[PDB]
């Protein structure tokens, strides 16, 4: 385990002691047994003293089955029987939930594993094996903290709370109920909605999906102690649990009958609280179908305050109840449940820390925990603000802890050796001679002690991680999905975005700066981390920055939605060309955009060509920028948490897709650049209305094809080849010299920079595959395509 | 609770007296027991007295517990054990007879809590605990209500009345009859339609929601004694209860089987009255979906008069059932059940006071009750007339119940200390380090007595509420949803709309007065609270005032619909761009408009840009303004009677988005404003027909631009940012001076007002994050962003 009681550990050490005290030198089970009776009156020990075994009595039997004498004090560790007895105690502590394995379990396990000399000791001293494990069993594992009340009662309350199900109040008079911690400010408005007689039913609305259920345990506690409303000093909180109702049932009618019965017992009225999780399913109102319609019984019950109950609902659900009316809305009365404030999140993290130290790690690091929240909110960003957090904590809170046991210092080579030993030894005896294995056999166990010694020198990598979570690590888990290497990502965002966007620094730094602002905490946690317009004809920088933003902003290159607004005008791939039949802008608002971002609430949203979209589209995107949400697709609310809204524009094109050209001067190229990095930021505004664009912050600048912009395209295409070759296991790189020979057949004026892919096909794809076919390069070696003296050359490296 | 009986209380105090008489300075449970038997022959006392226990017999044992003695009356209160016995009796009174506890319950509770000092006393004095609990239980005492009984007539009655169900007739033959508070004029018209054997079935049509069910108990009472026709003195009223049908069911087929069984027994025909609430559901006829098709048996039954029944259907519901015809049209025959008169509501409130006095927040305030109705009736309006009512009372019927138990005087600080004591106290003794605990213990209980003393000084906030709802309170609660600070909201409507909307006073006073007239109880809902036209093109204050009526006056937050008529057009729209394809005005009337308002009967419905809509759109909308109702959405009736319909005008845009700069002056601007608030009342005229405009309460005037929109755009974005940062828990405000500095980077000629987001990012997000990081500002302190010396400055406030 790695968690034990004193008593346990004490029984264990006593075995080795007894090995030698009796003449043995290897601790069989016999010494463990001895350990139990020699540990005196721990629950194992005590047990043995009850059934009639003394420390003496055991050790003499133990000694009569080797002992007196083999003494010379040969290395006293276990032997396989004895190891088995121990394996059982771990499970004999699991059995009763002891996460810190106690004395009892070792005797229980000993008996279970009742063979070896121990077994024989115990069966000799007038005690059957099961009589011994019994005695131990019937006295606790020693891992309790429940109960704090010894009272008794009987009252009208009996029929209701029986059925169906629990009593939160009980468990908090047993000193075993946690707040848990929410969402603290959430609990308060509920207590108004709970001391009424009409409107006496609370209904919590948020995301479910925030750990909402924590707020409920709040109530339990406050109904007990100590200053609370008059009927809340005469209230009991009883849970309506769906799980018990469905169990033993498989008919809808029977479920309804049972619910009717619960309502009959609800006669504790004006003094009873029923807690109903996921309230919607019972009401059955709205939608294209129900879910079971409790409403006939449920509606008058809810309005009158004979059923005074607590509803846990989500984004959409409330709409479909006030539509039902007029006892639905009578009962309900609202309370604000947030996707908890940055601070609220943090407190939850800390609260469940020690049990990821039962998932043996975090315990700590604090900076990493705060970050778990902060980094999560902005970096993935695919749930509500705390759910994300805790996931970073345990993931990273294991990731390095996984690195704990995978080597010695580098003495992993020992383990490798110990294997080779077995073999030589074995095969030699397997043929025989005896001694043709012997020295090999001996060499093995020498090795073994060394192996194991340096594997428990990598208890130092345990003491490193088994109370940590790492900053960099927590950050790493956020980087893994889609503090340190996410806030280093935040700080070095610019560096990361620059390494993946080549051409137009103007744009890169601009996205960087809006995002880094947001990513430091200040900016909406529920609106895009950047809204942007990404300018310049398609060919250089736009998409690539969106991608690069995923890498820096999200921690890995992945997860970017991308919808073309130019199709949404209901006249471009509405039915015209390749798309789908819908009347396209209605589809986009009504489903496409909202559904897509709903999958990853963090996704870099690239709304292409908002210029060429209808003016209605500009409003739709504007609504993302205003609300931070869009509600569509049957009333679902899509959380654009820290999406990066990127609105593209392909304008400026004539200069920005020109030829850098020698105008008569070689400074017509270096002034075609300087001109193009000017021309874009005025060409966007003319193609679409202002109402959208003003809630779009930075003006991201890019261009494309020139003389020179062309040669930036060649290096994008050659890179598209090299990545698709990796999946089989081929490591390829083109050096610039080889990209040059590829360019040699695509600097046409009469076919432009279109031929470059094709010239990559002949000189890269075709050449590498024809070089792999000849076997001068290979899988799992890095393969360099270079040009030497005007001719291509395929090389192999490492 | 505070509501017991003499005998109970008497049994309790006698314990303490005898305690001290025997040397028991804490009145044990042994003394409570002594108390029980010392009260002589009350049910607790008597009970004990049966089994053979004297006042004495207890007291001797008791004196043999704590000796005799040490009495000098060391803080003589009960034991915690003894306090448990009392809590139990309280529940034993909920459970048994009188809600307000009695003698029986105290011995019953003693036994129940049978372990501890009492228990051990009784177990020493040869009387088993349960033998005692028997004795008390069995003489609870029969409290009638004016009841009378002896025998029952007739034999045929057996199969039917068992099933399914309790009879209204029964409770009135034992003086347990209901008020009932109608809808009184409704009850009489039934007896014509019921002393028929032809159109033998009465059918009540009206809101759910009316409290229709009140009318039914009316009948019960008079059918017994005695104003009814000759065989209607010997009629019986039996209710078809949905709850019994669903209980024991397993399918739709089984539900039908139960209805079939009723029909066979229905042979009590023409002398039996069947009450079917929500009659429509069983017939299953009409609509796109049924709900179960009882109609095969039910239709001939109605025609025959074997089912001579009373149908309660909703305002809208009936149409798709009389449509079956004509043995359901020679059955049914309608009777007027109104949307309740204001007064009927009020009376229900009064009637249910004594259990709303259980949670000590009524009886009274009467004015608050009246208001409960009146304030709800026009605004929220999410239910129907009496649900609305009670819901405010009870809403408020907790709000104040919270204001009680949030403090002692301010001595919450005491409790905080008393905690800290325990710790210190404990930990010192745990070290032992005895006397270093001693004084800590003493300090603890010092605190405690004070703590508890000032927690029961907040019995004064109890005496406040335990008969009073608070007028202002009811009002606060209506404000929570959407008398005093809601009817002061009504009376002061201009002031309240002014306190949350700035400029266009012209609009405010007109809207204010019209809404206050209706909303103060002087306009019945059968035509909107206010229909209005709100004039002036974009950037006015139209929407904001509509919003502000809901929000400010009646609420504190949501209750505002908002529909654009230019999207729901027939020549400007049919299916164009975004949203649902159906031929657009047909979708809006036929579906959308009706659906939205049907959910909330009060929302300020703001029909935007209803000047670009043609007069055909206006004819249907005109009915909304006139009737307060539309029937659309598959024959559903939508209450706009409690909406405020607000219709806008926008077709002179150029003048109301005019900016006058030079006119040989710079005072043509400050005369372009004054001009625009005139020009609006003519912009109404240009594309809004007069037929429409007349069905309006007042013509509400607004005016826009002139200069001065830019720094208002900065104020829309900066507030949109900061509020979503309030979600994270940062309290931010921007002063106008700082919004001005932001505007400084956004008065570009060629790049429009687009830079304003970007400059908000720089001046708010970036600036606050660079100020929070340096600790100048605090997260969740109030942070003011200002310009000082023409340069921006971030300042701090609590």
Please provide a brief summary of the model.
With 798 residues, chain A is α/β, with parallel strands linked by helices.
Structural class of chain A: alpha/beta
Q: Percent range for helical residues of chain A?
A: 40-55%
Given the structure, what is the number of helices of chain A? 36
Oligomer: part of a larger assembly
Rg over alpha carbons of chain A: 36 Å
Protein name (chains A, B): Negative regulator of genetic competence ClpC/MecB
Family (chains A, B): Belongs to the ClpA/ClpB family. ClpC subfamily.
Region (Repeat 2) (chains A, B): 78-142
Binding site for ATP (chains A, B): 206-213, 536-543
Please give a structural write-up.
The structure is cut from a larger assembly and holds two copies of chain A (798 residues). Chain A is flat and about 110 Å long. Helix content of chain A is 47%, strand content 8%. By secondary structure, chain A is α/β, with parallel strands linked by helices. Chains A and B meet through helix 13, helix 15, helix 18, helix 27 and helix 29 of A and helix 5, helix 12, helix 20, helix 28 and helix 33 of B. Chains A, B: InterPro entries: AAA+_ATPase (IPR003593), ATPase_AAA_core (IPR003959), Clp_ATPase_C (IPR019489), Clp_N_dom_sf (IPR036628), Clp_R_dom (IPR004176), ClpA/B (IPR001270), ClpA/B_CS1 (IPR018368), ClpA/B_CS2 (IPR028299). Chains A, B: Keywords: ATP-binding, Chaperone, Competence, Nucleotide-binding, Repeat, Repressor, Transcription, Transcription regulation. Chains A, B: ATP binds at residues 206-213, 536-543.
């Amino acid at each position: 385990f790695g968690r034990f009681t004193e008593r346990a550990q004490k029984v264990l050490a006593l075995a080795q002691e007894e090995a030698l005290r009796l003449g043995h030198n290897n601790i069989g089970t016999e010494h463990i047994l001895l350990g139990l009776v020699r540990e005196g009156e721990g629950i194992a020990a005590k047990a043995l003293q009850a059934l009639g075994l003394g420390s003496e009595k055991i050790q003499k039997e133990v000694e009569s089955l080797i002992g007196r004498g083999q003494e010379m004090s040969q290395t006293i560790h276990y032997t396989p029987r004895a190891k088995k007895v121990i394996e059982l105690s771990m499970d004999e502590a699991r059995k009763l939930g002891h996460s810190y394995v106690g004395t009892e379990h070792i005797l229980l396990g000993l008996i279970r594993e009742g063979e070896g000399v121990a077994a024989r000791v115990l069966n000799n001293l007038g005690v059957s094996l099961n009589k011994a494990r019994q005695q131990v069993l019937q006295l606790l594992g020693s891992n309790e903290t429940g109960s704090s009340a010894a009272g008794t009662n009987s009252n009208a309350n009996t029929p209701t709370l029986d059925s169906l199900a629990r009593d939160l109040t009980a468990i908090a008079k047993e000193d075993s109920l946690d707040p848990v911690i929410g969402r603290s400010k959430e609990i308060q408005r509920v207590i108004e909605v709970l001391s009424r007689r009409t409107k006496n039913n609370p209904v919590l609305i948020g995301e479910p999906g925030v750990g909402k259920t924590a707020i409920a345990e709040g109530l339990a506690q406050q109904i007990i102690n100590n200053e609370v409303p008059e009927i809340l000093r005469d209230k009991r909180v009883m849970t309506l649990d769906m799980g018990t109702v469905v169990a033993g049932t498989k008919y809808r009618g029977e479920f309804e009958d049972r619910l009717k019965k619960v309502m009959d017992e609800i006669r504790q009225a004006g003094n009873i609280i029923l807690f109903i999780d996921a309230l919607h399913t019972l009401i059955g109102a709205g939608g294209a179908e129900g879910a079971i319609d409790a409403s006939n019984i449920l509606k008058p019950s809810l309005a009158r305050g004979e059923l005074q109950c607590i509803g846990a609902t989500t984004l959409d659900e409330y709409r479909k109840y006030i539509e039902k009316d007029a006892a639905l809305e009578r009962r309900f009365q609202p309370i604000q449940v947030d996707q908890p404030s940055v601070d609220e999140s943090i407190q939850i993290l800390q609260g469940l820390r020690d049990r990821y130290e039962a998932h043996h790690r975090v315990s700590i690091t604090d900076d990493a925990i705060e970050a778990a929240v902060k980094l999560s909110d902005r970096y993935i960003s695919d749930r509500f603000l705390p759910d994300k957090a805790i996931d970073l904590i345990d993931e990273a809170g294991s990731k390095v802890r996984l690195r704990s046991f995978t080597t010695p210092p580098n003495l992993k080579e020992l383990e490798q050796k110990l294997d080779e030993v077995r073999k030589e030894k074995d095969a030699a005896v397997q043929s025989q001679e005896f001694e043709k294995a012997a020295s090999l056999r001996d060499t093995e166990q020498r090795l073994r002690e060394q192996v194991e010694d340096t594997k428990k020198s990598w208890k130092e990598k345990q003491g490193q991680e088994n109370s940590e979570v790492t900053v960099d690590d927590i950050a790493m888990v956020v980087s893994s999905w889609t503090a340190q290497t996410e806030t280093d990502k935040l700080l070095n965002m610019e560096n990361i975005l620059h390494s993946r966007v080549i051409g137009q620094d103007e744009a890169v730094v601009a996205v960087a700066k809006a995002v880094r602002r947001a990513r430091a905490g200040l900016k909406d946690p529920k609106r895009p981390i950047g809204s942007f317009i990404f300018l310049g004809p398609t060919g250089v920088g736009k998409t690539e920055l969106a991608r690069a933003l995923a890498e820096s902003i999200f921690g890995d290159e992945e997860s970017m939605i991308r919808i073309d607004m130019s199709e949404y005008m209901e006249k471009h791939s509405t039915s015209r060309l390749v798309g789908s039949p819908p009347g396209y802008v209605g589809y986009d608002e009504g489903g496409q955009l909202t559904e897509k971002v709903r999958r990853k609430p963090y996704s870099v949203v690239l709304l292409d060509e908002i210029e060429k979209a209808h003016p209605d589209v500009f409003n739709i995107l504007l609504q993302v920028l205003e609300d931070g949400r869009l509600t569509d697709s049957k009333g679902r609310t899509v959380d654009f948490r820290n999406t990066i809204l990127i609105m593209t524009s392909n304008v400026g094109a004539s200069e920005l897709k020109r030829n850098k050209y020698v105008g008569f001067n070689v400074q017509d190229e270096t002034q075609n650049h300087k001109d193009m990095k000017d021309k874009v930021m005025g060409e966007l505004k003319r193609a679409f209305r202002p109402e959208f664009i003003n809630r779009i912050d930075e003006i991201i600048v890019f261009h494309s094809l020139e003389k020179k912009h062309l040669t930036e395209i060649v290096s994008l295409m050659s890179d598209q080849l090299t990545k698709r070759l990796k999946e089989q296991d081929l490591s390829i790189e083109l050096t610039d010299a080889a990209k040059a020979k590829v360019a040699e057949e695509g600097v046409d004026l009469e076919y432009g920079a279109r031929p470059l892919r094709r010239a990559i096909q002949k000189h890269v794809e075709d050449r590498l595959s024809e070089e792999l076919l000849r076997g001068n390069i290979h899988k799992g070696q890095h393969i360099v395509l270079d040009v030497e003296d005007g001719e291509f050359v395929v090389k192999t490296t490492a």
